[PDB]
Amino acid sequence: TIVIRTKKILVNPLLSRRQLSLDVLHPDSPTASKEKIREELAKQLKVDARNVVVYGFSTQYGGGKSTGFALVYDNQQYLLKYEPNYRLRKVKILGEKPNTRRSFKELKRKIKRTSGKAITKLLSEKKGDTWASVQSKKSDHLKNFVAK
């Protein structure tokens, strides 16, 4: 199978995590799937898989070696507060990313031309996804998850 060598590692107590460079050796098989790399790593570190997030990879011009960077968080409860909204939909935890631009630009249109009376109403119709909403969803992953 694969052979991973961990390369450059820092210790960030601030965001409570350790950052490391990864060098996957797959001489034979094609680039490793982030997923599979996620676990062969968690095993060498001996840490829950979901508390280890791996991002950015490459693949030297045909040679079976891929470089990448990963993250080790101690509390998935920390990981959930720090990681980016986009990395979460990626583990299928946060979800969708609907097209805000267009409509938001159009509401600006109406609102900029009204008095408070209606404005409030309009606002009660701008494409969802509040941050207040992002949190409640983040929170639910919090309680409902426990293990390792």
């Binding site: 820092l10 960030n12 601030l14 965001l15 950052q19 720090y82 980016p84």
Partner: protein, 259 residues
């Protein structure tokens, strides 16, 4: 011009930040603070590119905005993406109790020196101006834009004080005079540390100074660029890159690859 500038360009941001040329297009513009634009290191630079504790831009936004307080500058808390940490400062990374010196290389790049809980106490201050103000009282001012009340009177304008941050107390100062140790804050010669030889004032509007050091090199710079790192040979703080002394491109080679 329209009013007052407000941004900063990748390309235009000082070589002291050892910045990413390809990077982006801009660069965190230092906030009006204790140190001048060019002579400073905004925190975002300090953690992201320097320490490397942060990374992406939002990484900082967390660190300095997080209700925990992870960054200290001279015994105080800071939460500004670009607080201008300047020369001879002391920065502490709360969550790890890290203590650093904000000092220039020997090649003029901002370097982070690791201090022991010991030096982390004292910080070196250089004297800006000295005059008496309100109700018969004496005031001294430091480069670090420190304003001092009732300071020891044996202190001339171009002095250097040792500061006990813990007690916001002064102790053992030392003016610049033939026979001391110094650090040059900026110039074609910054990052160097030697023995003051003599100070020829020319009054016409610009006095100069000379210096010697380890390999006994001859140095020349304007007073405004001399910072007294100490009195009579003994330096007061641990210097980065060994001793404050740079090598010929020739000496670097022979030391490293031994040619």
């Amino acid at each position: 011009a329209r009013g007052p500038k407000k941004h900063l360009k990748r390309i235009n941001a000082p070589k002291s930040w050892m910045l990413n040329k390809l990077g982006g297009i801009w660069a965190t513009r230092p906030s009006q603070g204790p140190h001048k634009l060019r002579e400073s290191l905004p925190l975002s630079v300090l953690l992201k590119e320097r320490l490397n504790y942060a990374l992406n831009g939002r990484d900082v936004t967390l660190i300095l905005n997080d209700k925990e307080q992870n960054v200290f500058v001279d015994g105080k808390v800071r939460r500004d993406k670009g607080y201008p940490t300047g020369l001879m400062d002391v920065v502490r990374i709360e969550k790890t109790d890290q203590s650093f010196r904000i000092l220039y290389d020997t090649k003029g790049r901002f370097v982070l020196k690791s201090l022991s809980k010991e030096e982390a106490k004292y910080k070196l201050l250089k004297v800006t101006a000295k005059a008496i103000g309100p109700n018969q009282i004496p005031y001294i001012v430091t480069h670090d834009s420190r304003t001092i009340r009732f300071p020891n009177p044996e202190i001339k304008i171009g002095d250097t004080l040792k500061y006990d941050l813990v007690n916001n107390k002064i102790e053992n100062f030392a003016h610049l005079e033939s026979g001391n140790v110094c650090y040059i804050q900026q110039g074609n010669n910054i990052g160097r540390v030697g023995i003051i030889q003599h100070i020829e004032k020319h009054q016409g509007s610009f006095d100069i100074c000379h210096v010697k050091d380890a390999k006994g090199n001859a140095f020349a710079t304007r007073l405004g660029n001399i910072f007294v790192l100490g009195q009579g040979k003994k330096s007061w703080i641990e210097l980065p890159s060994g001793d404050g002394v740079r090598e010929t491109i020739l000496e670097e080679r022979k030391r490293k690859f031994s040619y």
